[PDB]
Ligand binder design. Sequence first.
Ligand SMILES: [Cl-]
Ligand SMILES: [Cl-]
Ligand SMILES: [Cl-]
Ligand SMILES: [Cl-]
Ligand SMILES: [Cl-]
Ligand code: NA
Ligand code: NA
Ligand code: NA
Ligand code: NA
Ligand code: NA
Ligand code: NA
Lengths: 311, 311, 311, 311, 311
Amino acid sequence: VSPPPPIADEPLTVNTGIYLIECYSLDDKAETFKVNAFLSLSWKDRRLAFDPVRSGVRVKTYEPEAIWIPEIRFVNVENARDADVVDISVSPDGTVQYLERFSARVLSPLDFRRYPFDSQTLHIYLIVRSVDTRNIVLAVDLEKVGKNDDVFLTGWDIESFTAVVKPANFALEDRLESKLDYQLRISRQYFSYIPNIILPMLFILFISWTAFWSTSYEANVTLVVSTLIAHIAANILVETNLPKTPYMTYTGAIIFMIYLFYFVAVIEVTVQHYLKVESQPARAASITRASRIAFPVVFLLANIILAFLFF
Amino acid sequence: VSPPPPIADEPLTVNTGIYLIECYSLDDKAETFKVNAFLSLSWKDRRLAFDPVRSGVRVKTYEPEAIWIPEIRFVNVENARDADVVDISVSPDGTVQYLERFSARVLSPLDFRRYPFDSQTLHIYLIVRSVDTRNIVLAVDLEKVGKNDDVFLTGWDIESFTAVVKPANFALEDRLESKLDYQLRISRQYFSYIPNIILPMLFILFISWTAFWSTSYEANVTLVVSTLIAHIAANILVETNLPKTPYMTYTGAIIFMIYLFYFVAVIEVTVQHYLKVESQPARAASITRASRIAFPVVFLLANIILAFLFF
Amino acid sequence: VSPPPPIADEPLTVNTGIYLIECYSLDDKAETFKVNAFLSLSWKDRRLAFDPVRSGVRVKTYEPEAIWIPEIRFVNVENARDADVVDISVSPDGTVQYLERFSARVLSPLDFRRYPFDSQTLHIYLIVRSVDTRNIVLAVDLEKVGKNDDVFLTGWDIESFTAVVKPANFALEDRLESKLDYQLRISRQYFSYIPNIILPMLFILFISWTAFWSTSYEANVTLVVSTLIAHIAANILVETNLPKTPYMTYTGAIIFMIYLFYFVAVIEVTVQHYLKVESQPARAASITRASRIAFPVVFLLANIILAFLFF
Amino acid sequence: VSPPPPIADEPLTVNTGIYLIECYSLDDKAETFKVNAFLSLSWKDRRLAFDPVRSGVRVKTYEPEAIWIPEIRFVNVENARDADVVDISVSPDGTVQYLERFSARVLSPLDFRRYPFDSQTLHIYLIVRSVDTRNIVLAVDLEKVGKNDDVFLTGWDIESFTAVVKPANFALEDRLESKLDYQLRISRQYFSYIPNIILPMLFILFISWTAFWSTSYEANVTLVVSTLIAHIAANILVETNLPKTPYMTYTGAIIFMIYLFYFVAVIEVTVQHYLKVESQPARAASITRASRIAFPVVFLLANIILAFLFF
Amino acid sequence: VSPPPPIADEPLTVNTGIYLIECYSLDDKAETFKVNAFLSLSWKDRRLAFDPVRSGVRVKTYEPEAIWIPEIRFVNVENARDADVVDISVSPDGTVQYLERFSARVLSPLDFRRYPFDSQTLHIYLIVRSVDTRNIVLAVDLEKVGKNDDVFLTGWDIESFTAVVKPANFALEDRLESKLDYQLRISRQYFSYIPNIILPMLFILFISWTAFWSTSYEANVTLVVSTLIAHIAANILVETNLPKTPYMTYTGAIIFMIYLFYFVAVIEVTVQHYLKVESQPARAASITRASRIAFPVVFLLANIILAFLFF
Ligand SMILES: [Cl-]
Ligand SMILES: [Cl-]
Ligand SMILES: [Cl-]
Ligand SMILES: [Cl-]
Ligand SMILES: [Cl-]
Ligand code: NA
Ligand code: NA
Ligand code: NA
Ligand code: NA
Ligand code: NA
Ligand code: NA
């Protein structure tokens, strides 16, 4: 229970694979997701080599404690993975085949710039630290990388699960570490956002614009202030499903812009009333008639500009 | 502590059974449920054969570490099950009878299309992977599949708990896997939705239609905008109890449609005021009188169409 | 470490007791409660008998691993109990006295029909499964059933903690099972519901009835619609503290009924305005004056009927 | 291992001490708090005595499994404490000095009568049960009772951490039990309640009283009903931070009383409008002018009475 | 497995290092954060010294149970850290190099005075208690203190991770204790607060000031009372993201001040209506015209004063 000795001076290659069984709990605010998968490991340990003829077997099954196993860890996990060894098999030439089933909570940053029309690349970083005896390097066995067809992540479409085959080798506390990047590509199912948030938010805004066909200040004040309050409710609802970002987001940009439209509508309603009281309704009529065209036109142009800047 | 040897070349059959003791925490948003049950396992291990005359006893009792036990796992769990072995009984021929009590979280997708008048089939998948010495296959002992009479899932009716007797045998990462599908059929108790959400939502909508018997624009604006805000509160309440779906739901369809009715009622109230101010009340009167019939009639027809498309 | 052998063919009687130390976290929505208690067990093991005059020792203290202990479990628990053995004492005749302190999360259905004036019977079901060597039956030692005087369940009065002395003996998966029912009787402290929910809800309803002393349609619309919105807020608040039931609760019935009163008040306010506009105020005056008496009278009678149907 | 034998017939005295390292998560609704502390224990075990000269050591260190250690438990904990033994030192006469660091979630009832100007005495109850061989009694070593200077409980001032030196000795399940009461005295930091809840609540109430300087019924209805809704929001906010109590609380009393003031203000606004419509404004003017003085005066007197009854 | 003996009388120096791998869950209300890191320890044990010439090995690898390891703990953790030993290496002179990967929930108070433009110094306190055989003192190996480049704390900028090299040596329960202070300096990303909370809050306040260009009391009452309610919603939203502090926060001060502006605006709207009704509109006009300048000017000056007092 020391590492396999090198024949010359070569690093020990540990072949890896991850096969996804379950994907769940993608938490946008926490920027975490839970995973249940198979982790497969393979390496050459000559001390375990045997003759098939003499032994009368083509495979040898060991218990984890009986042999040397590389200390493989995940970089971006909350706590160490919950793992259960499934099988350890040794071929006559000492080729070890290790299989474990694990569950882990993974930290992986999300880009919310295009929310809710966003795509993400979730990462699972595999790592191994070298020992004083020898250097350990990781490799990808593409034959053992995959996912169950039933793997579903509520509210998302799973595109692919692949591995960057070339490890990132680097020094950490005067020892070599070898890191692999497993990538889960997902795209958000934006469907439900349209009848639940986007269209209700547009309906209340268009309702505030009916004030441009009314001379009644008291009815106008009621129309614009009431719909503004409903917009505040939606702003609060949206920001509870999202983390605080150093950058602007598409939904955040639209929500912010709609406040400007409420603010300018209040100015218009105030200006209209003021002129009416001052016995200059001809003026007030010109501003109100212009507003009927200006507000939807500027709203459409501003949305085209925003969609262009974000997509 | 290697698998039982084959007399010829056949696979080792592991007979299974699940007996439900408790069902709790059906989380609609998470699409999970918690289960507390008996897991029974049975297989022949002739290496454990004994003479009752020599050993004195008619049945031998073993500790899990003393004998070979098949590595049975659940596919769709969050974490590995919490299990406590209740008994391991070995009969003279070598037939093992294994009993454990376990608790587990189960991932099982839910179809919300007909919510809150929906039924679900929850799944518990049992799996075993084959070893090199021999192939292991799962079977259902129907005599050991069941549920306690007191098993209750708050807000649901439990219909049945059965197993698909034919396992799904397939290759996974160059070894055989034998999978069993245990199905828990449940139907939602829709009762409470009627006095708590459906009737309050209808009352506020009918209250907005009183604007069709009023010429007072300022009272009308108050009626339609205030009831709209109450509808937004209900929309938010409903969407918090449900996950985001790539498809429309019945409740979601009705909630969305009721916005259209509020939006068209605002148009009517605006059109009515505009004509009144323009000294054309005869027109306004014709539109308002038509609206008194059109709004409830189109609401009833649209609901018949929706109920038909969903049920 | 096999069960004690029978002198004739009799079942092994395991005397039980539960002494409550702490009661906490009664979750109405989850229908669970947490418990911290002593579990006492007593049975005869003749293999462990000793001479009192020869040994000098009146009692012998064993470690759990040194002797046979019955596998006692709880039926209605989320997960297996967290237990710590306190003492194991053997008397000369071989009578074993076992004591453990445990904590567990218990599933126990609640009847919300009379909420918040409801009483509940929480259950803790003890169970033992018979072995092939012999049948194990449970009994209650009333001397070892009780609760600490300081045991408090926030928002509830603890009435009694008793056990149904006769076990439920039945066959489960071809073996005998012996089940005991420990009952914790509690009654809800309804006090706080009166100044926090009931009286505020009545105040807003009575405020809507001031519309029956007003001819101002615009003020009336404001009175009835605003108070209705406040009632919706209370409806939502109440239903968050309760699970969804396939029956009406007492509070649910009152909350539902108050909607009818708001709906009929809107009809009255509409009818009054319509007649006034139609130059028939004498009529409107008769309906409004009748409403001043009818609304409080029908509200009182409907509440007497509801209280009678529920209590 | 067995308890230390008595020289005569005396009970074994176990000297105790608790040194607080961290205090966190005081949950008002749950009436729990989390603690991280040192637990020190000391007792004489003659069997472990040694001569310093022939040993060459003035102190002897032991592993917990090597010697007898009293089974000390906490009464008012959710689950058994998470403990790690730090040191076990034996002096020549066999005086054992035990030290462990533990973490526990403690149940301790809170008196909310004077909230948010309340003080609490949190308890940590230490207990030991007697064995058949001998009686075990607890004592306090005041030299080993204390707290780290950095111990902070968010939202509270920590006054003292002391122990009631005389244990409560009593019989439980036919064995004697020795209980110690460790008391943590804390006082609530009421500061934030003034600008966040108290003053905003007073501002909206005073805003409703502007209706006593207005003859406009429509504006008055808007003033009193809108501010009432804001008061309902604060009532809901406050009751979410508190458990349901069988007794009234100070904040609860004020919140309830403010509803009466809203209810009576609506009566006044109604009475004023009714008289105005009946062509008796002289009367209405007398009631409104009286209300301008009566409402603030009765509000001040009622608050003096409440503060007196509660403090 | 006793501590290394001193050559003279010197304390044992344990060199420490923490290398951050993950930072997550900075909870403002709980004043906690979770950390995943490497903990490195180094000390001399002469009993483990060997000859490198005759051994042919430069380093010897040990299992934690095979050698003496100092009991290092964290002061400000909720529960004991979850640790996994990575490596133990011994140099020929007997210098031990210990490496573990751990995860822990850390308690560290936060200063909210300047929120959301605040910076924090999070602490991780390392501690060791001296043994009876010898005094243990901690030191910092700056070569083994650091953080992964990918370390991200959502909503924060990570400035530095350093250690105070001089330990705090002190007596605690009649033994020496050696404490090290590891400091993680972070600054809040205030960006999102501007379009989500600050600007919406300013827009509603400016909307209330349009009442200074209106003579309509009923419209004015609607403007000031409706926006006040929206301000209450924001006050509640902000105080849910923050703990209760015995001091004013910057945001808390602004939120409180904005209430005064609403309260004085209601006084103005009331005074204006009263004078008009009293047939003194010339006066009312002078107060309203002054208010148009006074309200924005006093708001700007008060904000300059507040920003100055807090920054
Ligand atoms: Cl890991
Ligand atoms: Cl499993
Ligand atoms: Cl159990
Ligand atoms: Cl304990
Ligand atoms: Cl620690
Ligand atoms: Na190994
Ligand atoms: Na086995
Ligand atoms: Na045993
Ligand atoms: Na011991
Ligand atoms: Na050690
Ligand atoms: Na109004």
